[PDB]
Design a protein around this ligand. Sequence first.
Ligand code: HEM
Ligand SMILES: CCCCCC/C=C/CCCCCCCC(=O)O
Length: 411
Amino acid sequence: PHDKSLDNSLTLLKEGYLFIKNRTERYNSDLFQARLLGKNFICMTGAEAAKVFYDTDRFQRQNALPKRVQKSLFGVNAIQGMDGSAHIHRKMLFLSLMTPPHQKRLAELMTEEWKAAVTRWEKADEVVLFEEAKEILCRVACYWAGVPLKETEVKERADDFIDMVDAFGAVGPRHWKGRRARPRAEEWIEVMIEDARAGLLKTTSGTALHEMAFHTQEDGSQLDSRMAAIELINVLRPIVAISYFLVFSALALHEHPKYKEWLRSGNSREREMFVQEVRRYYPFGPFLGALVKKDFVWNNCEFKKGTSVLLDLYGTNHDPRLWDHPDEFRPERFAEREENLFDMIPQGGGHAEKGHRCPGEGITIEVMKASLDFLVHQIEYDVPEQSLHYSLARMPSLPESGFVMSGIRRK
Ligand code: HEM
Ligand SMILES: CCCCCC/C=C/CCCCCCCC(=O)O
């Protein structure tokens, strides 16, 4: 099929997470052609389509997206835009800092932070979850990474990380906030990398700050100071971005009350299932872009070298073919469900060691479970009159108020 509208980029901004899905459903097809982001695109959805999108013999990520994404969200010429052995090499760096051990450690640091926070929340009237999550996440991320952070900087660093995240799919003021935060963050971290390399800053083998500063490329040389900084930021920023998910989890509890008790009469088993469903059900990652690097045919389409393609993350997560009642929050659906690498792709598909799939997925899940645990067992609270509406057009999305909690008491 071929949408020939000449304003599809504009429509993409108005429809956001539903742009691809509205059409694939309209054309009764898992693929369609369109002119987007100033390029000739093929948009696809579904697990099968995801499997092809991740075939690295047919797709490359270099030059696949407008540079505006690199100048806000990613950092210029970083891991997201690399291909081949070089990508895999650097990808191994990231992965080595996200193994189960680091995961466990980050969950641990979060559990401690939430416990301590109870003391202050009990004394406050209201608390904005998003705001509290960003700061705790930024505190933990930096400590675990060995990145010095003075209490006076916390808010400012956390705020800068979110501005980058919030600018990825925006135009205007929202996008500019990201353009201005990235250089502040980069210089801040670049100076640390350099201090570390001169031995003027204590670093610990095994920590992100350390590994990024001393990492060696396939050619034996260290990354440039700027790049090492950009890459450490691609570790820190995303951890702080977990705040969006933490908030959707609280939203889920509030909008679907039964699960609060469901969790309570439950184990970690049920927390896992709830967290899985939060990531599948709520919008965060919209779609991924790549370029056809060698002609091929799939599902009766001809992908020609040089063509841009968008893989629909959100739509796929809501595909009835693999998810019964896909538009409803039901962590029960995960009841001993077999793990699959493409039926659900909120953080990418395939294998993280064989593609660009998110290497921080385990960390995301463990931090989400630890945080969920806190909301369900460590405190009691009310959810006052507020705007909890989240947009499917706005990218990224977040319950409007940031999720205000009041009357907080230790349980
Ligand atoms: C807050 C929730 C998160 C979401 C929704 C998310 C989503 C994604 C998506 C969709 C991709 C692209 C996959 C592809 O290109 O095929 C990605 C890449 C990545 N994420 Fe996550 N991510 C999250 C958290 C994290 C965390 C906590 C870390 C750090 C520990 C992290 C580190 C990365 C890195 C380094 C990449 C790029 C890897 C590559 O290109 O090979 N992410 N993420
Ligand atoms: C014109 C809009 C283009 C949008 C491009 C979409 C890029 C994919 C986004 C991945 C979202 C990642 C979620 C936040 C994690 C992070 O901080 O990296």
